[PDB]
Amino acid sequence: TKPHVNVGTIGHVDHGKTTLTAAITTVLAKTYGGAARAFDQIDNAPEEKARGITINTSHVEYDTPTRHYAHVDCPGHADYVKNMITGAAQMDGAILVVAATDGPMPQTREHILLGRQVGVPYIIVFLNKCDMVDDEELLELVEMEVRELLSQYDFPGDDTPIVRGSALKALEGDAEWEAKILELAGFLDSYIPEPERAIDKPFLLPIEDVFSISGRGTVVTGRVERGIIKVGEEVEIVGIKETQKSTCTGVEMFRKLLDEGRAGENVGVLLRGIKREEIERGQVLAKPGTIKPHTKFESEVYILSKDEGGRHTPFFKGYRPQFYFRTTDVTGTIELPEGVEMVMPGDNIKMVVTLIHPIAMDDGLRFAIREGGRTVGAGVVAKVLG
Numbered sequence: 606t607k608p609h610v611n612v613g614t615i616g617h618v619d620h621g622k623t624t625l626t627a628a629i630t631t632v633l634a635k636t637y638g639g640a641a642r643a644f645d646q647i648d649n650a651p652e653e654k655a656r657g658i659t660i661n662t663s664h665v666e667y668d669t670p671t672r673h674y675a676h677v678d679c680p681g682h683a684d685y686v687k688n689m690i691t692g693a694a695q696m697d698g699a700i701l702v703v704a705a706t707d708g709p710m711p712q713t714r715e716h717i718l719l720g721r722q723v724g725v726p727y728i729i730v731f732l733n734k735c736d737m738v739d740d741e742e743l744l745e746l747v748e749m750e751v752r753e754l755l756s757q758y759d760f761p762g763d764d765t766p767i768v769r770g771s772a773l774k775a776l777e778g779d780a781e782w783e784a785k786i787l788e789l790a791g792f793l794d795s796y797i798p799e800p801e802r803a804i805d806k807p808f809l810l811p812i813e814d815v816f817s818i819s820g821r822g823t824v825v826t827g828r829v830e831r832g833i834i835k836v837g838e839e840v841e842i843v844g845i846k847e848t849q850k851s852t853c854t855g856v857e858m859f860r861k862l863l864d865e866g867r868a869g870e871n872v873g874v875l876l877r878g879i880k881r882e883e884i885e886r887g888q889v890l891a892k893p894g895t896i897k898p899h900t901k902f903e904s905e906v907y908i909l910s911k912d913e914g915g916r917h918t919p920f921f922k923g924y925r926p927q928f929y930f931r932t933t934d935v936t937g938t939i940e941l942p943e944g945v946e947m948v949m950p951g952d953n954i955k956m957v958v959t960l961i962h963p964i965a966m967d968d969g970l971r972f973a974i975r976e977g978g979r980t981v982g983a984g985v986v987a988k989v990l991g
């Protein structure tokens with residue numbers, strides 16, 4: 606099967622993301638095979654529901670000779686904010702569209718900054734509307750502006766592929782400009798490395814339940830998030846309390862006794878030496894020395910709007926909600942950015958959080974913000990602090 610890669614268009618409004626998305630599907634369909642999509646179908650994005658969050662998202666698919674791509678395009682900036690923090694698939698790379706007529710605009714900066722925060726790993730640039738620009742001096746100056754902006758947020762601007770093109774003329778059928786769509790698709794193939802598959806990451810299992818099995822000791826159940834756990838291998842129980850070491854003495858799937866549990870499977874793991882009461886809501890099983898527990902972190906959060914089922918009134922710096930990490934709520938206190946004293950429903954802000962219990966975490970881990978039982982926001986860990 607062809608490798609699967611998740612991409613999407615980002616960049617400022619009216620710079621040509623949707624026209625480019627249509628052009629890519631159209632050009633690749635007539636060149637390497639597939640199904641073309643038209644501008645109107647993609648611009649008219651369905652409402653996708655992620656929890657209570659409403660995100661207008663168009664999903665499109667296209668193939669290169671060697672890869673299958675799932676591409677995400679959204680109508681408005683508000684959708685890109687929501688999608689980057691809580692969208693169905695995390696982008697493996699992004700196509701930043703920049704209109705040569707306008708140059709980098711405020712959401713060009715914001716989407717790069719968000720990409721950095723939510724951990725978007727590769728960004729390719731399509732410099733659009735070049736059918737309007739005859740001057741090569743201008744095009745060079747815009748290209749340098751985009752490279753500086755990428756580097757400002759630690760992307761490798763100097764080595765970043767930038768394709769000078771015209772999404773519109775390519776969608777209209779002009780073969781000269783279509784070649785630029787193939788150049789861009791070439792860069793998707795060559796510049797975005799194939800992402801790391803979960804089965805190859807160090808073992809991780811969020812604990813959902815614990816039982817004292819008769820004559821066999823303590824078992825913890827959960828979905829293997831990544832890696833492989835084998836009978837005989839050592840594990841760490843990470844989070845809430847001081848970290849404990851243990852050994853796997855059995856892997857059970859329903860009534861079937863296994864020798865290993867793999868990423869994606871729902872299993873029960875028998876642990877030597879651990880008593881049922883030594884296990885707490887919110888802990889994970891992990892390969893030893895691969896994930897650490899933290900109480901403090903920086904995050905990018907989106908606060909739900911009233912219509913989405915969230916808060917009706919803003920909160921202030923004393924806000925003390927619950928942060929739901931994998932399996933449980935942990936209370937935290939927050940610090941706001943300087944100048945911000947109030948956070949309105951529907952806002953998104955950088956939030957420094959201090960939980961009252963440690964949670965095993967790494968950059969890019971998603972969480973929900975909750976009040977009482979109900980969800981009021983969504984975040985991504987941008988930087989762990991300790």
Ligand SMILES: Nc1nc2c(ncn2[C@@H]2O[C@H](COP(=O)(O)OP(=O)(O)O)[C@@H](O)[C@H]2O)c(=O)[nH]1
Pocket residue numbers: 616617618619620621622623624625648680733734735736737770771772773774
């Ligand atoms: N002249 C020219 N116009 C373009 C090009 N790409 C897009 N446009 C026009 O710019 C407008 C906005 O494009 P659109 O894809 O909807 O922008 P989006 O908000 O980023 O999705 C539309 O009128 C497009 O047809 C291009 O390469 N050349």
Ligand SMILES: [Mg+2]
Pocket residue numbers: 622623624648679680
């Ligand atoms: Mg659009």
